[PDB]
Structure formats: C-alpha cells, structure tokens
Short mmCIF file of C-alpha atoms and ligand atoms in Angstrom, two decimals:
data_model
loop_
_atom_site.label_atom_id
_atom_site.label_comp_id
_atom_site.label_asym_id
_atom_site.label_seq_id
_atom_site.Cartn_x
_atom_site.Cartn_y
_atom_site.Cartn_z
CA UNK B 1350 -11.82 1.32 -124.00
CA UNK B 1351 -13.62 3.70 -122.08
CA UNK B 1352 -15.52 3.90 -118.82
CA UNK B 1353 -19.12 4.56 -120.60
CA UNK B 1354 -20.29 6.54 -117.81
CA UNK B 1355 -17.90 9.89 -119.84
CA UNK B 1356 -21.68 10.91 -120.99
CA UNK B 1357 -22.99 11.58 -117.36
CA UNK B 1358 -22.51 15.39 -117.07
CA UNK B 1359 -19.00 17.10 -115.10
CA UNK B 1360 -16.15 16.99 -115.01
CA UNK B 1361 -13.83 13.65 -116.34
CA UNK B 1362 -10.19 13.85 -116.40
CA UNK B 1363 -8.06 10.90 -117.23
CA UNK B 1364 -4.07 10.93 -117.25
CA UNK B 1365 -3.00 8.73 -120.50
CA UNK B 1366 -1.10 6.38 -118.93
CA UNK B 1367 0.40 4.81 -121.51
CA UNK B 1368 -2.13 3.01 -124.13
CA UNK B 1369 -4.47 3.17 -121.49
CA UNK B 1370 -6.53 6.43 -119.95
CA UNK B 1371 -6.84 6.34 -116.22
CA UNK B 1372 -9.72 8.36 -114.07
CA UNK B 1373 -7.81 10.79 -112.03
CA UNK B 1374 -9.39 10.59 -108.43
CA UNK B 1375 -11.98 13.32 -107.38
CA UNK B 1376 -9.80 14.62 -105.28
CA UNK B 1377 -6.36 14.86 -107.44
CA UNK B 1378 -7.79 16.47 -110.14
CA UNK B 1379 -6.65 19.72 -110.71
CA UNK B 1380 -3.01 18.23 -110.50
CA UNK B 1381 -1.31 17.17 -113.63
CA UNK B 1382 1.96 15.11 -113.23
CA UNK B 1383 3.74 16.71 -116.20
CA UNK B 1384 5.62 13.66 -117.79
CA UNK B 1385 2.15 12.58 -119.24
CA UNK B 1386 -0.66 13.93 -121.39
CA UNK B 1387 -4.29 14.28 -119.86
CA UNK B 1388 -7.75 14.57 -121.12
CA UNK B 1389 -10.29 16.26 -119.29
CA UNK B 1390 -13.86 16.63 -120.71
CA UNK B 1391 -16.51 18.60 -119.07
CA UNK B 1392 -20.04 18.39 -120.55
CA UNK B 1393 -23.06 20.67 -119.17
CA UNK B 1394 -26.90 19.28 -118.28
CA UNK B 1395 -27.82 20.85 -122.05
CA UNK B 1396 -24.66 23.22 -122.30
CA UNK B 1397 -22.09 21.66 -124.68
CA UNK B 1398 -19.57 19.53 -124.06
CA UNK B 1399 -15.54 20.32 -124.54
CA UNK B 1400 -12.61 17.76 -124.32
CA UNK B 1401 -9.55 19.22 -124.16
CA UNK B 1402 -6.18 17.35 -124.44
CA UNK B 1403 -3.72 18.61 -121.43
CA UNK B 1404 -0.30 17.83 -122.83
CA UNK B 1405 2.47 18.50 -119.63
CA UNK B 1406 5.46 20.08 -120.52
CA UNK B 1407 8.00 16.73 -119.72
CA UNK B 1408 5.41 14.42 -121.73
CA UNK B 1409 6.48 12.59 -124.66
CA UNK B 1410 6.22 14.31 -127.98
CA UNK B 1411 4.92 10.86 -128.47
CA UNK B 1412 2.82 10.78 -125.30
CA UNK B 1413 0.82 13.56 -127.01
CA UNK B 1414 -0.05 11.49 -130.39
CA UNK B 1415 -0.97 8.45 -128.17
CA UNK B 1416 -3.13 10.58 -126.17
CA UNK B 1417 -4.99 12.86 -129.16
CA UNK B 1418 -5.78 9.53 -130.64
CA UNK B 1419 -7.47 8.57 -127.98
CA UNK B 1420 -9.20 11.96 -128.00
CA UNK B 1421 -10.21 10.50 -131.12
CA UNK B 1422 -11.32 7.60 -130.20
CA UNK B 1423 -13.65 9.62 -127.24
CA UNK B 1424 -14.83 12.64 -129.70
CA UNK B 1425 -16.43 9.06 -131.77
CA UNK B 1426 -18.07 7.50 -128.17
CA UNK B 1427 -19.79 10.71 -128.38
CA UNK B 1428 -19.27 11.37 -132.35
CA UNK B 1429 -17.50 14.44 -133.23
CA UNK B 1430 -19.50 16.13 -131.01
CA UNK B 1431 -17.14 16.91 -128.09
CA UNK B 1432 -14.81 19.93 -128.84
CA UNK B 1433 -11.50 19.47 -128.86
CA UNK B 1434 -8.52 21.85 -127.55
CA UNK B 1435 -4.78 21.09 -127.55
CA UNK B 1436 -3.73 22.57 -123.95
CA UNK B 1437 -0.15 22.79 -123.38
CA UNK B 1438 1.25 23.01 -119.56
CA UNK B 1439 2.13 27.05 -118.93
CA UNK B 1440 -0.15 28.65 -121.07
CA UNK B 1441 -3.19 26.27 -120.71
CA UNK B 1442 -6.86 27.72 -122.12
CA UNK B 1443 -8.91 30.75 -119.93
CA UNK B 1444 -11.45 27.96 -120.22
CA UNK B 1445 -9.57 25.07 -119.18
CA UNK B 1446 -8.70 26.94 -116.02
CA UNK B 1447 -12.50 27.56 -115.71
CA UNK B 1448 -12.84 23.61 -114.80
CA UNK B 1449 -10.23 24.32 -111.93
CA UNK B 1450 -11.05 26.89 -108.89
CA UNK B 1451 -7.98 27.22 -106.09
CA UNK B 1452 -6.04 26.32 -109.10
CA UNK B 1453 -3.52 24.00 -111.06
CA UNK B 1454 -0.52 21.79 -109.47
CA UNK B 1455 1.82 21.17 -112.04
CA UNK B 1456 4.15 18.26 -111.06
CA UNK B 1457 7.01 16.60 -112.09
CA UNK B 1458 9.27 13.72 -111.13
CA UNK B 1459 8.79 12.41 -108.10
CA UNK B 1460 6.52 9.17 -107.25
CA UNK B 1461 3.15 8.53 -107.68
CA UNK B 1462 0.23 9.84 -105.38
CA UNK B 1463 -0.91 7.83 -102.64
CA UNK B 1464 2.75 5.83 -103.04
CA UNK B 1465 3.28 3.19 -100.15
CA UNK B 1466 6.42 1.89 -98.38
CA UNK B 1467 5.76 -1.87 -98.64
CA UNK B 1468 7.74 -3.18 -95.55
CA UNK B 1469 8.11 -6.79 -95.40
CA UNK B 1470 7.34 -8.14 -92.19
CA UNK B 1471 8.39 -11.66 -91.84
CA UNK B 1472 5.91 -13.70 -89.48
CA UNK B 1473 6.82 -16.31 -86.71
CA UNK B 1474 4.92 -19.44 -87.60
CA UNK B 1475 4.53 -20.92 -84.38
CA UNK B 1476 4.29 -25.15 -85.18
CA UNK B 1477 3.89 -27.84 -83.48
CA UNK B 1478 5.33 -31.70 -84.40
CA UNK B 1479 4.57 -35.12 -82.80
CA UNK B 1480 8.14 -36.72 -82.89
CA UNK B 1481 8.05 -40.56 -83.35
CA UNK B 1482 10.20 -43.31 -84.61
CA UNK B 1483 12.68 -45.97 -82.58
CA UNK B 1484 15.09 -45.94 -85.05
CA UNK B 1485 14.37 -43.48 -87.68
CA UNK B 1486 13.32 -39.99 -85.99
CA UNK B 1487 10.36 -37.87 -87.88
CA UNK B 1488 9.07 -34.92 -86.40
CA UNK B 1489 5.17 -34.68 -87.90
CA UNK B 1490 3.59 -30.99 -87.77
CA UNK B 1491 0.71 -31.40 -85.32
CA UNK B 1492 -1.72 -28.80 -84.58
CA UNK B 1493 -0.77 -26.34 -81.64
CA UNK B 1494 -3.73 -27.90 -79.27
CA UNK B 1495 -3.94 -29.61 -76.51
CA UNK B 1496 -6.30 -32.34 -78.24
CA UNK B 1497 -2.92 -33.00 -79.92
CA UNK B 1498 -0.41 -34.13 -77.18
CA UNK B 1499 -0.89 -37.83 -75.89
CA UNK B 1500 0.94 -39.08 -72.79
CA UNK B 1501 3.66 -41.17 -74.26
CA UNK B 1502 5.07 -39.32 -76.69
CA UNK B 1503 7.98 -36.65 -76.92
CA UNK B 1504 6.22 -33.05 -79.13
CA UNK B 1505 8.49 -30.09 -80.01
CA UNK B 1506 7.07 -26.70 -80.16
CA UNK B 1507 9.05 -24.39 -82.27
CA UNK B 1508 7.02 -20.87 -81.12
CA UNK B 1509 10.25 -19.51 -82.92
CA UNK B 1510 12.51 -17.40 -80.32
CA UNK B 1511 12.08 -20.85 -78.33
CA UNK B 1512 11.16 -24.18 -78.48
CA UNK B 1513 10.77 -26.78 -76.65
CA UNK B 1514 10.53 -30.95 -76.28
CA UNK B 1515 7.99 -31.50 -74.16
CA UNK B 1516 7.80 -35.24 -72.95
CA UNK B 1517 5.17 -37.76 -72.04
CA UNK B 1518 4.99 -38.86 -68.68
CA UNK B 1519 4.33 -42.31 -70.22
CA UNK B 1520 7.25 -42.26 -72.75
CA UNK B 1521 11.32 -43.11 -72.51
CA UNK B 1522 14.41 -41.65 -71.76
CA UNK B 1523 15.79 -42.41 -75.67
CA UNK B 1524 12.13 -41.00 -76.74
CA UNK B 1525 13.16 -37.98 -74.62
CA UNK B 1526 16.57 -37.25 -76.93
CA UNK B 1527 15.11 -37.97 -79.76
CA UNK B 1528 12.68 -35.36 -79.43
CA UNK B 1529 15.95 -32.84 -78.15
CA UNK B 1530 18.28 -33.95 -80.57
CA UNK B 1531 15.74 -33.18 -83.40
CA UNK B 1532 14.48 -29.74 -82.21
CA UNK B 1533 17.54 -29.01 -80.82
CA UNK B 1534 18.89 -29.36 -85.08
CA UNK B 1535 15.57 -27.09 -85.11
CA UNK B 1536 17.35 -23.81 -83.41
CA UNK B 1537 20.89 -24.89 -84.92
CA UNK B 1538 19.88 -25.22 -88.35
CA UNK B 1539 16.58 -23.18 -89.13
CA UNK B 1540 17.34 -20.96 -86.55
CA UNK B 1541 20.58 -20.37 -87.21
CA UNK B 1542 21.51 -20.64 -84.13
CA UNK B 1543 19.99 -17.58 -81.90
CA UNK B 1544 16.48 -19.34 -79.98
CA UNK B 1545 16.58 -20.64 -77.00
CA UNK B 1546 15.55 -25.08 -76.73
CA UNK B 1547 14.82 -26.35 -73.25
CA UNK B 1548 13.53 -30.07 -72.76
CA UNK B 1549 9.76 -30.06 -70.87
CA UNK B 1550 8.34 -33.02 -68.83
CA UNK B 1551 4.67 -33.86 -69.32
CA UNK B 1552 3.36 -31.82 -65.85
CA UNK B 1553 6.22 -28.91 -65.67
CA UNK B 1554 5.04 -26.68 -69.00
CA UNK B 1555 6.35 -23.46 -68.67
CA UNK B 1556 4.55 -20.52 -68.71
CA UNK B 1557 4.84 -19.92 -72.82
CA UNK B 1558 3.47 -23.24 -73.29
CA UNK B 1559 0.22 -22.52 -71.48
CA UNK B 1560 0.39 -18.82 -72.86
CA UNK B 1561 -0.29 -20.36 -76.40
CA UNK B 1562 -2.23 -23.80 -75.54
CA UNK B 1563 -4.00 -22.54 -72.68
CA UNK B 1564 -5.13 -24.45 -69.74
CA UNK B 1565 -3.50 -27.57 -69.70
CA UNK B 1566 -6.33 -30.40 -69.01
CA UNK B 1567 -5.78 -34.49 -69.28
CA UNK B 1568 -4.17 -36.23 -71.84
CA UNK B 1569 -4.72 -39.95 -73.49
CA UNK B 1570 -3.12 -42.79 -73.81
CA UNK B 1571 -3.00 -43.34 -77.25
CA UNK B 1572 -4.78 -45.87 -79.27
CA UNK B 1573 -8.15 -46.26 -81.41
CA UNK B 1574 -10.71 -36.37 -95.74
CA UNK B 1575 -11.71 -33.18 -94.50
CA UNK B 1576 -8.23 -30.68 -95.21
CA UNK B 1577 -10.22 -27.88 -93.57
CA UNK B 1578 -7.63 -26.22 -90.98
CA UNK B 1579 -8.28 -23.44 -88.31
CA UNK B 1580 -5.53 -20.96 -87.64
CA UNK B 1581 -5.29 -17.86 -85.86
CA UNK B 1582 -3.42 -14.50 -86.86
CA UNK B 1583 -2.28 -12.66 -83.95
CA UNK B 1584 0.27 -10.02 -83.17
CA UNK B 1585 -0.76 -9.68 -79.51
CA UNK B 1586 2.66 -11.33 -78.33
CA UNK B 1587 4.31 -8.12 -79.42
CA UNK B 1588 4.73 -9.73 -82.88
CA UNK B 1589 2.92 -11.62 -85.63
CA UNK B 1590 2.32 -15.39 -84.92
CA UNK B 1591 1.01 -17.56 -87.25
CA UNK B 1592 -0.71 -20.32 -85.52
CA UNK B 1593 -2.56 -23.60 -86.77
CA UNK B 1594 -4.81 -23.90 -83.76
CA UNK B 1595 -7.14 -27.24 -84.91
CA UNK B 1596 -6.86 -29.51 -88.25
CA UNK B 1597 -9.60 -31.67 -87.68
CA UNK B 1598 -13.38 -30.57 -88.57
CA UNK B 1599 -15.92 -30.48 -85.77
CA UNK B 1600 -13.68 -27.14 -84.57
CA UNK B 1601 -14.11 -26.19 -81.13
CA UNK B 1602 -16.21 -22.99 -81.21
CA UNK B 1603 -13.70 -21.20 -78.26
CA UNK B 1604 -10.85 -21.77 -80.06
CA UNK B 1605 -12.08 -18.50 -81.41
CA UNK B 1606 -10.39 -15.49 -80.17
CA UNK B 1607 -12.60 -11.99 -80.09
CA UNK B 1608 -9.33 -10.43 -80.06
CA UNK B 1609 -7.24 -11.68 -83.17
CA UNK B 1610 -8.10 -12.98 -86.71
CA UNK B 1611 -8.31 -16.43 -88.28
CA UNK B 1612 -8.41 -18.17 -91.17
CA UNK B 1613 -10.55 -21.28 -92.11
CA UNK B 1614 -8.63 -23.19 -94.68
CA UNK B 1615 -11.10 -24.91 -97.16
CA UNK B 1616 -10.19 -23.93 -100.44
CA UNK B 1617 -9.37 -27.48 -100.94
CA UNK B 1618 -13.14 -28.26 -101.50
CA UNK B 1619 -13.99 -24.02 -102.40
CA UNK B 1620 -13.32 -21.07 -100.43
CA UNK B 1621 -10.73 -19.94 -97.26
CA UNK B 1622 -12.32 -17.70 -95.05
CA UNK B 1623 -11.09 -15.11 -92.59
CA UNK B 1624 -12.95 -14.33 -89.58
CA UNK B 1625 -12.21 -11.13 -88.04
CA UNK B 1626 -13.09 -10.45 -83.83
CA UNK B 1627 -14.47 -7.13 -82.70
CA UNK B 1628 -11.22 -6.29 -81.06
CA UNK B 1629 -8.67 -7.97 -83.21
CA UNK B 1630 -6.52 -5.10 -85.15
CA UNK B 1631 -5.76 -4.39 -88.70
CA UNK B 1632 -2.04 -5.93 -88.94
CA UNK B 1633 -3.68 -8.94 -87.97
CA UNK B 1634 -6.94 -8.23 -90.86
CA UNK B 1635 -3.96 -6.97 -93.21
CA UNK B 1636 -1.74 -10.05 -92.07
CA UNK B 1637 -5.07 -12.20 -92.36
CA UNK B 1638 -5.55 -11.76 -95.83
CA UNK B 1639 -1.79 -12.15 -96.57
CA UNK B 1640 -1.68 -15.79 -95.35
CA UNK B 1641 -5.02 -16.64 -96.96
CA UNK B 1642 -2.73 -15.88 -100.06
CA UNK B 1643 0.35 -18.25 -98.76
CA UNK B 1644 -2.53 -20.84 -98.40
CA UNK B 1645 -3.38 -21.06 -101.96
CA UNK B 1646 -0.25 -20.69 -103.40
CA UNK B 1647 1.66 -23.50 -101.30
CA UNK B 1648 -1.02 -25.86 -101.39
CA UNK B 1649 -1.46 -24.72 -104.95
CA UNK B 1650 -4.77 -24.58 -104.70
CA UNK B 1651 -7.48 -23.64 -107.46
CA UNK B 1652 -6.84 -20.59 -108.59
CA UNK B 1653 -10.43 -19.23 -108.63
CA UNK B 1654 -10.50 -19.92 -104.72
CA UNK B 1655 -12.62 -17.49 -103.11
CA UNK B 1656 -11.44 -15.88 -99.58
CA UNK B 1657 -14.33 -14.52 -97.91
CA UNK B 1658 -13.81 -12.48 -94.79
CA UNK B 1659 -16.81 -12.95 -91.64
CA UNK B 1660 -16.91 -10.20 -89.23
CA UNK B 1661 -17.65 -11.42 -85.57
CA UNK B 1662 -21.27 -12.03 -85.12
CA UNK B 1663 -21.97 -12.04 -88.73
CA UNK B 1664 -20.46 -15.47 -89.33
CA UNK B 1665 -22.15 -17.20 -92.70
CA UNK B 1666 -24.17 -20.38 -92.20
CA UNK B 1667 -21.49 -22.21 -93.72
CA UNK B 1668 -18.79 -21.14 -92.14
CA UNK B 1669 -20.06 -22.44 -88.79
CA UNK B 1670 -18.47 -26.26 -89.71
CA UNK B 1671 -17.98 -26.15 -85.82
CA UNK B 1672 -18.91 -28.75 -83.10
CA UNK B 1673 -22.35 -27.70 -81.43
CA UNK B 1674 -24.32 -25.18 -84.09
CA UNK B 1675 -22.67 -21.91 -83.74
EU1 EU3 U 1756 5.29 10.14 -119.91
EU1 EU3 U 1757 -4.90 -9.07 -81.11
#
C-alpha cells in the first residue's frame, strides 16, 4: 500500500511505522528516530534506482523483518529492479550518506516531531431561557437577542460568571421569583456556587446585558421547521463565549460580527458552516471548528455532515439564508 508517486525521481524516505510506511516530511528527512526501521529510495532521471532499508539501532529485531518485507513488497511496485541495501544505524553505507548533505540525526526516545500540548479550554456558553409557568416553573433556552424578550415575561441570562432575571415591565411580582428562584438554582447548582445572580427590571439592564444584546430597542406584547441556528464564537470578552445569537431563519444580516467567528447550524437538512470576519482571530477559527463538531455530535447529526468554512466577503450563495439578499 504505497503512495504510487515512489517512481517520480528523488529522494523517498518512509519510517515503517508499524505495518504501515509513512512519508517522512521534506524537511525531517535526514533524521531517523532509532526505535524504527526506515526505507529510503532514491532513483535518478535515467541513473538507477537504490532502496535501502535503514534499520535504527533501538528498532525491533522484528521491526526490521516487517520493514524488509515491505522492501519487498516496493522492489515488486517497481519489480526487482530497485537495489536493495540493509543499512544499520552507526555504520550506515558511503552511499546512503550520499542522499544526506549537513548530515544524519540519529534519535531516540523522546516524542514525536511536531508533538502538541493539547490544552483543554473549557468555553462559557452564554444562554439565554424564557421562564414561564404559574405553577410549574420551566426555564426554555431562548436565543440571546433582543427579538427574543417580550414585555411580560421574567428571562434569565446565564453569561456564566453572572446571570441575571431580567423582568417584564408587564409581568408579576410571583413571575419575578420564579424567574430568581430558578436561575438563582442556576449559580447554586451548575455553578457550584461561585457567579454572581442579580434580579433586572425591564428598563434598568446593566451594562453586560447591553454588552452582549446590544442596543436595547422596544419590546412586544406577546401574542400571534427550519432548525437552522446562528451563533457566534468570540473570545473578545477576555475569554471564549459561545453564543446562540438567532434561531429563526430570515437571520438578520448585522448580527454578523467582522470581528469574531460564527457558525450556521444546518446540518439538520446538510451542511454547518463557519463564517470567519477579517479581524476575528484564530482561537475563535480554531474554537469555530471545535463547536461545529459539538453540533453534530449532540444533535447526532448525519455523520457525513459537511462543515464548510466562508471567509468574509466570500460568503457562498447559499449560505446567505439571511433577510434582505446578502
Ligand atoms: Eu519500534
Ligand atoms: Eu474577536
């Protein structure tokens, strides 16, 4: 199971993995870890062609039969016609050296190259619920939008370090400890403890409130399938915020900002898409991605769900499922 492209002439050096020979990067060739068994073939325009079998010094007495039969296996791609050599680490061939100029970097232990520190950084999922209920209380998760809040009704907005149970002008005193009692569990519970709740009246938001919704306009009343979701990716708060800015489909083109990343949720009917501003950063394209992931595997959604990322300005056709034709 080789590439097919080991006929192209130069230089191809694979480190036997362990059933399987991997390419060794352009750039790390010349180094060998020494706990596994190599094969390096260099072939000229109309010069012949040599495959030699680089066998480290800590690699398996084993390692070396696995990796000689798949010389094998190679010298047939090409039929017999490669040469072979048996290099051992320490006393390798005046002609194996030959593919290698400054020289050869034996290693040993150690981690593999290009070895990452994967740091898991949890996110604040910043949510918003539409309490309701006279005798039986259930907090509903809302989207964080303005369009969302009506007049009579008690909202808690759990933007994680605090929350709060904002209250309809229009709406009663029991509505009002409902909604505190509930998100005040919120911070208890979930929280642990350590956030801080404090009880809003329609008119009086707080700065954070308008920091995340914006410019607070009018509000209804209150009386009268498409799963796509909007949410935006954002670490601009000094930390990563996961927010579900608008649920229902004719999305409101500014809801867009140039500065952070988002994620259209369709993979219900196809593909979730993440839209990437000019100036939004890479935690929040790395982070972007990352929750496109929690999206299908939550929702369980198809597996074959395709996540296609839009840079700003080069938006797909499709993807513009906003109100007025982006
Ligand atoms: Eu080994
Ligand atoms: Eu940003």
């Amino acid at each position: 199971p080789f590439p097919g492209s080991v006929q192209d002439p130069g230089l191809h050096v694979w480190r036997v993995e362990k059933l399987k020979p991997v390419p060794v990067a352009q750039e790390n060739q010349g180094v060998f870890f020494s706990g596994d068994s190599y094969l390096v073939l260099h072939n000229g325009p109309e010069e012949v062609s040599h495959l030699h079998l680089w066998i480290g010094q800590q690699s398996s007495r084993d390692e070396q039969g696995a990796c000689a039969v798949l010389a094998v296996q190679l010298d047939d791609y090409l039929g017999g016609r490669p040469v072979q050599h048996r290099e051992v680490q320490g006393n390798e061939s005046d002609l194996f050296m030959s593919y290698f100029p400054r020289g050869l970097k034996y290693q040993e232990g150690g981690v593999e190259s290009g070895f990452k520190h994967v740091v898991p950084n949890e996110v604040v999922v910043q949510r918003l619920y539409q309490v309701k209920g006279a005798k039986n209380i259930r907090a509903t998760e809302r989207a964080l939008n303005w369009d969302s809040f009506n007049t009579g009704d008690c909202f808690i907005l759990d933007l994680g370090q605090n929350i709060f149970a904002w209250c309809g002008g229009k709406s009663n005193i029991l509505e009002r400890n409902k909604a505190r009692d509930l998100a005040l569990a919120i911070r208890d519970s979930e929280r642990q403890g350590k956030a801080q709740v404090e009880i809003v009246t329609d008119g009086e938001e707080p700065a954070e409130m308008i920091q995340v919704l914006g410019p607070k306009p009018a509000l209804k009343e209150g009386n009268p399938a498409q799963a796509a979701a909007l949410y935006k990716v954002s670490d601009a708060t000094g930390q990563m915020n996961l927010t579900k800015v608008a649920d229902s489909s004719p999305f409101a083109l500014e809801l867009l900002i140039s500065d952070d990343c988002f994620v259209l949720d369709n993979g219900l009917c196809g593909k979730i898409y993440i839209w990437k501003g000019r100036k939004a950063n890479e935690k929040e394209r790395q982070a972007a991605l990352q929750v496109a992931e929690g999206f299908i595997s939550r929702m369980q959604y198809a597996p074959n769900t395709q996540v296609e990322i839009l840079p700003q300005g080069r938006e797909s056709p499709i993807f513009k499922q906003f109100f007025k034709d982006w």
